[PDB]
Write a protein that holds these residues in place. Structure first.
Motif, PDB file in Angstrom:
ATOM      1  N   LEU A  91       0.805  -1.211   0.000  1.00  0.00           N
ATOM      2  CA  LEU A  91       0.000   0.000   0.000  1.00  0.00           C
ATOM      3  C   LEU A  91       0.844   1.270   0.000  1.00  0.00           C
ATOM      4  O   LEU A  91       0.293   2.352  -0.211  1.00  0.00           O
ATOM      5  N   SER A  92       2.163   1.171   0.194  1.00  0.00           N
ATOM      6  CA  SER A  92       3.038   2.341   0.150  1.00  0.00           C
ATOM      7  C   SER A  92       3.758   2.506  -1.184  1.00  0.00           C
ATOM      8  O   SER A  92       4.364   3.558  -1.417  1.00  0.00           O
ATOM      9  N   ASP A  93       3.702   1.507  -2.062  1.00  0.00           N
ATOM     10  CA  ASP A  93       4.285   1.586  -3.400  1.00  0.00           C
ATOM     11  C   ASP A  93       3.222   1.097  -4.379  1.00  0.00           C
ATOM     12  O   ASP A  93       3.095  -0.108  -4.614  1.00  0.00           O
ATOM     13  N   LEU A  94       2.476   2.031  -4.971  1.00  0.00           N
ATOM     14  CA  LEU A  94       1.345   1.669  -5.811  1.00  0.00           C
ATOM     15  C   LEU A  94       1.734   1.442  -7.276  1.00  0.00           C
ATOM     16  O   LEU A  94       0.862   1.487  -8.147  1.00  0.00           O
ATOM     17  N   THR A  95       3.009   1.165  -7.564  1.00  0.00           N
ATOM     18  CA  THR A  95       3.415   0.816  -8.924  1.00  0.00           C
ATOM     19  C   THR A  95       2.639  -0.411  -9.383  1.00  0.00           C
ATOM     20  O   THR A  95       2.705  -1.454  -8.712  1.00  0.00           O
ATOM     21  N   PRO A  96       1.907  -0.344 -10.494  1.00  0.00           N
ATOM     22  CA  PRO A  96       1.195  -1.528 -10.989  1.00  0.00           C
ATOM     23  C   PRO A  96       2.183  -2.603 -11.407  1.00  0.00           C
ATOM     24  O   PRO A  96       3.061  -2.369 -12.241  1.00  0.00           O
ATOM     25  N   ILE A  97       2.051  -3.786 -10.810  1.00  0.00           N
ATOM     26  CA  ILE A  97       2.903  -4.920 -11.145  1.00  0.00           C
ATOM     27  C   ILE A  97       2.114  -6.105 -11.669  1.00  0.00           C
ATOM     28  O   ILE A  97       2.709  -7.117 -12.058  1.00  0.00           O
ATOM     29  N   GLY A  98       0.788  -6.017 -11.699  1.00  0.00           N
ATOM     30  CA  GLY A  98      -0.034  -7.114 -12.143  1.00  0.00           C
ATOM     31  C   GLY A  98      -0.483  -6.854 -13.567  1.00  0.00           C
ATOM     32  O   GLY A  98      -0.977  -5.767 -13.883  1.00  0.00           O
ATOM     33  N   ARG A  99      -0.267  -7.852 -14.427  1.00  0.00           N
ATOM     34  CA  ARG A  99      -0.743  -7.766 -15.803  1.00  0.00           C
ATOM     35  C   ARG A  99      -2.266  -7.746 -15.824  1.00  0.00           C
ATOM     36  O   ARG A  99      -2.918  -8.569 -15.188  1.00  0.00           O
ATOM     37  N   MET A 100      -2.828  -6.793 -16.561  1.00  0.00           N
ATOM     38  CA  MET A 100      -4.277  -6.663 -16.679  1.00  0.00           C
ATOM     39  C   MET A 100      -4.769  -7.571 -17.798  1.00  0.00           C
ATOM     40  O   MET A 100      -4.476  -7.323 -18.971  1.00  0.00           O
ATOM     41  N   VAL A 101      -5.523  -8.617 -17.448  1.00  0.00           N
ATOM     42  CA  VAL A 101      -6.116  -9.468 -18.483  1.00  0.00           C
ATOM     43  C   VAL A 101      -7.256  -8.726 -19.175  1.00  0.00           C
ATOM     44  O   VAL A 101      -7.258  -8.551 -20.402  1.00  0.00           O
ATOM     45  N   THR A 102      -8.243  -8.290 -18.387  1.00  0.00           N
ATOM     46  CA  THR A 102      -9.226  -7.280 -18.798  1.00  0.00           C
ATOM     47  C   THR A 102      -8.528  -5.929 -18.688  1.00  0.00           C
ATOM     48  O   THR A 102      -8.606  -5.231 -17.675  1.00  0.00           O
ATOM     49  N   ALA A 103      -7.812  -5.565 -19.749  1.00  0.00           N
ATOM     50  CA  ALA A 103      -7.082  -4.310 -19.771  1.00  0.00           C
ATOM     51  C   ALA A 103      -8.025  -3.124 -20.011  1.00  0.00           C
ATOM     52  O   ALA A 103      -9.069  -3.263 -20.643  1.00  0.00           O
ATOM     53  N   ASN A 104      -7.633  -1.959 -19.494  1.00  0.00           N
ATOM     54  CA  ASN A 104      -8.375  -0.712 -19.636  1.00  0.00           C
ATOM     55  C   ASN A 104      -9.897  -0.799 -19.491  1.00  0.00           C
ATOM     56  O   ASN A 104     -10.626  -0.275 -20.332  1.00  0.00           O
TER      57      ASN A 104
END
Lengths: 103, 102
Positions: free
Chosen positions: A48-61
């Motif tokens: 919760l202190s580093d919100l860099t997205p690291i998970g690939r979005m399958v349902t992207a955007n």
């Protein structure tokens, strides 16, 4: 008009996130707002202190398409192995769900 | 544990719209009540060659609701020249021609 902002209101969990058997997780939500269409602020982060997205979005955007309150939404994502947090919304609208992925 | 593909008919609601940053948004409505289900949507070069090309910006979209006539919004990056946005198959297939220039 040509571009839609991110959704500004809170989302709510409609079910617990569920493993798909394909190294991915499906989450069913509702959007409490009526400012749709708008883009869903969803990601998987290390902490919760580093919100860099690291998970690939399958349902992207993914979008909320409805202008009616509490419409249903479905998103699928690829968490890293180990510990992560599913995060939806920002600031004091944020909901989080801690996730652990194993083999 | 896994949702299947939507089997009923969709409909294009309005024209696809240029967002101004080299993508196109399309609003659809779903006629079925078998949701949640996966939307059969792709961009193709012609109706006789359904190989997916271009890029789906809203990739792998689902219908989330179980009621008929639910709204969905999809964003795409069609190739330059002619393409078709294709939703559904066989008897339920609907398609929208698109030409992208410069």
């Amino acid at each position: 008009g040509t571009t839609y902002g991110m959704c500004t209101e809170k989302f709510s969990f409609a079910k617990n996130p569920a493993d798909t058997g394909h190294s991915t997780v499906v989450l069913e939500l509702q959007y409490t707002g009526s400012d749709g269409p708008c883009k869903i602020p969803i990601s998987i982060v290390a902490s919760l202190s580093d919100l860099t997205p690291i998970g690939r979005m399958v349902t992207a955007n993914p979008y909320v398409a409805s202008s009616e309150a509490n419409a249903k939404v479905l998103v699928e994502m690829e968490p890293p192995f180990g510990d992560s947090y599913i995060v939806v919304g920002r600031g004091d609208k944020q909901i989080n769900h801690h996730w652990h992925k194993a083999g």
